[PDB]
Design a binder for this molecule. Structure first.
Ligand SMILES: Cc1nc2ccc(-n3ncnc3[C@@H]3O[C@H](CO)[C@H](O)[C@H](n4cc(-c5cc(F)c(F)c(F)c5)nn4)[C@H]3O)cc2s1
Ligand SMILES: Cc1nc2ccc(-n3ncnc3[C@@H]3O[C@H](CO)[C@H](O)[C@H](n4cc(-c5cc(F)c(F)c(F)c5)nn4)[C@H]3O)cc2s1
Lengths: 138, 137
């Protein structure tokens, strides 16, 4: 039983083969969800499911450095349903993040910020209840 | 061994199976392919491409009912034209894991879940093969 927003510390930074697993439930009339892998006030990887952008559901990914966003990467596969439980797994590899939801591959996001040791927090927020958040090696 | 080569997987694939392949990339290689086959379906296709829009990339996918799915792509590219390599593929309960020259390269979650039905590993494209075997670890 965790609270939201939740900043999961990643004390040593991220490394290849780290698998982060987040379990929770989408709030019944959710509008947005966010996972932010942060390096200080910069966001190495922002993963943002939007339940209604111009009447579509879309996940937007991007990077924030010095208070500026970059080029968005967008994906319409949308495995989240309002009110329903979900398992998100983020696998960190040497060149990208890979995300799977409910054990199914969703997307990949190539590293823009290359200093993986400095990514030391994962911010989890938006319209969810959070049951658990941890990581392991695979 | 001669390429293309089909490595039989007599009891299919199962967690803890390790496959080890040694060969050499041809100096003018364009593509390499490892295909875990179940009939016409390919549970996991591993496809290093040496020149796709002037980049090297590895493309992974699954073919089921004659249709490919969503690709997983890797820019980490451990193969060099002309050079020997070692590929190991470990089957785990949740995914295949692939290491090249003893370094982790990628993982690929299972999409086709009936692993015991995978009967052959096809090895082809721009390589020469010194050996290919499987063991349980
Ligand atoms: C170079 C660029 N200039 C712009 C200008 C505008 C935008 N627009 N237009 C709509 N929304 C955006 C922005 O897109 C970003 C992704 O590219 C972030 O998602 C950004 N954003 C969302 C959130 C957020 C905060 C929360 F508390 C949440 F719970 C939550 F779920 C999301 N914080 N920042 C969002 O405002 C994008 C860009 S890229
Ligand atoms: C839903 C989809 N619609 C498309 C449309 C086009 C493609 N494009 N566009 C370029 N190449 C592709 C295809 O990507 C596939 C993986 O997603 C396979 O690699 C597919 N392919 C390569 C090979 C192959 C055969 C050989 F004998 C080799 F030696 C060898 F090294 C590779 N067999 N099949 C390839 O043609 C992909 C997709 S997925």
């Amino acid at each position: 039983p965790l609270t939201v927003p939740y900043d999961l510390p990643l004390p040593g930074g991220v490394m290849p083969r780290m698998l982060i697993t987040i379990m929770g439930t989408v709030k019944p009339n959710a509008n947005r969800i966010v996972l932010d892998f942060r390096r200080g006030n910069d966001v190495a990887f922002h993963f943002n499911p939007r339940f209604n952008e111009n009447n579509r559901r879309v996940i937007v990914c991007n990077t924030k450095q010095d208070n500026n966003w970059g080029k968005e990467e967008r994906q319409s596969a949308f495995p989240f349903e309002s009110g329903k439980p979900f398992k998100i797994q983020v696998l960190v590899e040497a060149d990208h993040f890979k995300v799977a939801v409910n054990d199914a591959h969703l997307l990949q996001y190539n590293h823009r910020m290359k200093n993986l040791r400095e990514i030391s927090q994962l911010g989890i927020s938006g319209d969810i209840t959070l049951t658990s958040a941890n990581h392991a090696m695979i």
